[PDB]
Each structure stands twice: as C-alpha cells, then as structure tokens.
Ligand binder design. Structure first.
Ligand SMILES: [Mg+2]
Length: 152
DNA sequence: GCCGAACTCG
DNA sequence: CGAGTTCGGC
C-alpha cells in the first residue's frame, strides 16, 4: 500500500488501553525498528526477537512508559500483525501451532516465529529520513491529548 | 519467566 | 465477542 495508508495505520495501531491510558508497546516497537534502520543495524527486512531489538525497545519504551506499563516486548512483536504490514516468518513445523498461539512470553515467540518482517514497500519507505519523521509524528496520534505531558 | 486468569476496550 | 494488555502462583 501507499505512504498515505501507512501514515493512517501508524496513527491507529489499536494499542491496549485502560482508563484513558494507552499501553505504549506497539508504538515503542515501531519506533525501535525505525531507530535500528536509522542506525544501520537493520539492513535487511529481517527483525529477530533478539537482544538488539529488546534493548532498542526498552530505550523507547522507558521514554514513554508510565508506572503501570510493563516491559514486555513479546506482546507487540506478535500483536503488531493485526496492522497488516507486520508479518511473521513462522518456524518450520510450527504453522498449525502458530494459528492458536498466544504471545505469553519469549519462549512462545521463539517456538513459533523465526523473525518478523515488514511489507517490502514499508521497509523501503522507512529507509527514508523524511518518511521516518512523518511516521514518527503519526505514531504520536495513538496517545490521548490528556496523557501527552507524560507520554509523547 | 512461565501461562491460565483477569481485566478493559471497542 | 476477540484483542491486547497485566496479574499472580508457580
Ligand atoms: Mg483494554
């Protein structure tokens, strides 16, 4: 799809919410992926559930988190697939388990998913500084006006 | 850190 | 009703 449609989807990731507060996991993971691209740490469209992703997620997650949020990178790593541009390369022999899997922890991710990957169009677009700046602003639209002071 | 259970969103 | 979170006993 087009840059317009990605901008729209990055603005509406359907994050978990509770009493007005938005779980920032899906935002922090997309920001971490864009960070990795920017730094040249993610040259191929192949996003492993590894220390490098977890550290980049934690850096962004800590910037956004409230006291109630828990550093659980396995959750957006799985649940971002409802966005339509975030996909899972499923491990050999795991195709049927994957269908009813839950992202209950790291071993559940590692059993089922070899790595995550993007739409090829999105991956190419994110090579572009202007696109990353655009989609970064789009991600902030997931957060309510009332929490912007603590979560932006 | 695991996952069944609980919770809230919509 | 399912999605996407946190909780709690282990
Ligand atoms: Mg909720």
């Amino acid at each position: 799809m087009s840059l317009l449609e990605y901008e729209a989807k990055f603005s509406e990731l359907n994050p978990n919410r509770r009493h007005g507060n938005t779980s920032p996991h899906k935002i922090a993971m997309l920001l971490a992926v864009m960070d990795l691209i920017e730094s040249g740490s993610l040259q191929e469209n192949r996003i492993y559930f590894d220390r490098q992703l977890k550290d980049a997620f934690t850096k962004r997650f800590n910037e956004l988190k409230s006291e109630a949020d828990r550093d659980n990178p396995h959750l957006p790593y799985y649940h971002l697939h409802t966005s339509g541009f975030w996909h899972h390369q499923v491990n050999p022999g795991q195709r049927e388990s994957y269908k009813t899997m839950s992202a209950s922890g790291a071993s559940a991710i590692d059993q089922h998913i070899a790595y995550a990957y993007l739409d090829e169009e999105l991956f190419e677009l994110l090579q572009n500084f202007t696109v990353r700046k655009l989609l970064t602003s789009a991600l902030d639209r997931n957060f309510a006006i009332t929490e912007t002071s603590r979560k932006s």
